[PDB]
Amino acid sequence: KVYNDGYDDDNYDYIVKNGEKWMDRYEIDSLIGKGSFGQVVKAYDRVEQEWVAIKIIKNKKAFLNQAQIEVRLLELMNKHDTEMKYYIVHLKRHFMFRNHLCLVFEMLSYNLYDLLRNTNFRGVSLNLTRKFAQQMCTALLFLATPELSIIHCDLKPENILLCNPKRSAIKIVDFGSSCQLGQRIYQYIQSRFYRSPEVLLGMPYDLAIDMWSLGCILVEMHTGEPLFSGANEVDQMNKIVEVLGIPPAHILDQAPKARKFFEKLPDGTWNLKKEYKPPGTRKLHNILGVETGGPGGRRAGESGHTVADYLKFKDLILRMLDYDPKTRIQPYYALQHSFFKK
Ligand SMILES: O=C(O)c1nc2ccc(I)cc2c2[nH]c3c(Cl)cccc3c12
Numbered sequence: 493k494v495y496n497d498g499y500d501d502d503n504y505d506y507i508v509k510n511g512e513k514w515m516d517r518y519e520i521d522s523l524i525g526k527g528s529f530g531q532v533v534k535a536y537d538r539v540e541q542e543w544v545a546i547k548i549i550k551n552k553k554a555f556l557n558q559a560q561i562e563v564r565l566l567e568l569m570n571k572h573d574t575e576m577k578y579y580i581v582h583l584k585r586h587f588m589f590r591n592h593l594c595l596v597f598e599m600l601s602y603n604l605y606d607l608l609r610n611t612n613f614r615g616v617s618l619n620l621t622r623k624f625a626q627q628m629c630t631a632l633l634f635l636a637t638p639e640l641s642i643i644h645c646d647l648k649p650e651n652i653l654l655c656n657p658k659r660s661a662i663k664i665v666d667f668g669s670s671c672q673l674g675q676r677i678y679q680y681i682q683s684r685f686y687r688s689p690e691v692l693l694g695m696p697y698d699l700a701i702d703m704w705s706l707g708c709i710l711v712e713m714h715t716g717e718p719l720f721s722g723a724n725e726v727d728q729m730n731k732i733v734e735v736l737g738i739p740p741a742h743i744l745d746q747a748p749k750a751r752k753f754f755e756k757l758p759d760g761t762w763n764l765k766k767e768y769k770p771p772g773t774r775k776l777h778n779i780l781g782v783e784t785g786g787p788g789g790r791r792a793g794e795s796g797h798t799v800a801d802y803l804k805f806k807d808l809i810l811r812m813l814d815y816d817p818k819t820r821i822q823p824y825y826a827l828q829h830s831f832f833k834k
Pocket of ligand 1: 524525526527532545547581597598599600601665666667
């Protein structure tokens with residue numbers, strides 16, 4: 493009947509009203525996004541004389557506390573990037589309003605999945621993919637600084653926003669599922685398509701999980717389609733194996749969940765448990781179209797898509813997709829890679 497004295501709906505969300513004034517400061521314009529956490533509204537900040545995005549968290553304890561974690565991490569980050577040069581969304585301030593935690597951010601545009609839809613799921617150019625890659629690796633370098641040691645834990649196209657729909661600048665959003673290296677708590681993390689092998693295998697994890705996700709994202713940005721589109725964990729592992737082969741024995745031998753996906757043979761080697769291409773036969777070389785005109789052959793006869801360019805990109809991606817989190821490429825070295833040698 494009544495939710496939050498009439499201010500909320502039956503989904504724990506604030507009922508947005510165009511033109512409402514809050515706290516003698518914000519005039520709410522319109523709803524511009526929503527998700528599991530709540531809503532995002534465009535509002536005018538009359539004190540600072542600028543448009544802002546306000547993320548209005550659901551009035552529900554689990555969502556509140558998720559956002560409190562997010563606020564703490566954003567405050568830590570923003571504090572160490574006062575010039576806003578490391579591609580993390582800027583939290584301006586926060587407040588509690590009518591039993592909703594509200595996070596005030598800079599305005600941004602839509603996400604990189606919306607950009608892919610805008611390409612009719614045919615992909616962005618290799619040059620634009622490179623610009624996204626360079627910004628993302630720079631962000632991951634900042635998150636790896638020791639005072640931060642932040643693992644985002646949910647990198648996907650939907651959590652990377654354009655600043656402006658006609659430009660390449662991005663910001664990473666949604667630190668609600670994030671953690672710090674000193675303070676890992678979650679066993680179940682990462683959205684499935686972008687989930688690292690160490691997490692699938694129930695093994696220890698660190699900031700390298702975010703690099704795995706980035707490798708997956710960058711291929712998808714150029715092809716238009718997810719690299720590893722599993723329907724469930726077993727399918728996800730099998731799709732990874734089609735491209736990358738059986739994981740190293742030294743890893744599977746230490747993996748609590750190895751036998752969810754694999755079986756250990758009499759000779760000590762590992763094979764898949766019993767519909768899929770044989771291990772390692774779905775070549776990234778062919779998914780990218782390195783020698784055959786890029787994805788779908790559609791980049792044949794276009795500049796900015798040579799065999800040489802594609803071989804650089806393939807090499808970087810394979811380093812991001814190293815099964816071993818100890819040897820998987822780290823942000824500093826990703827930035828030095830020949831793919832970014834203009
Ligand atoms: O702050 C975010 O996690 C955030 N998440 C969103 C989820 C779905 C949609 I649709 C939009 C989201 C979103 N949009 C944002 C804008 Cl426009 C500025 C600053 C942060 C965000 C943000």
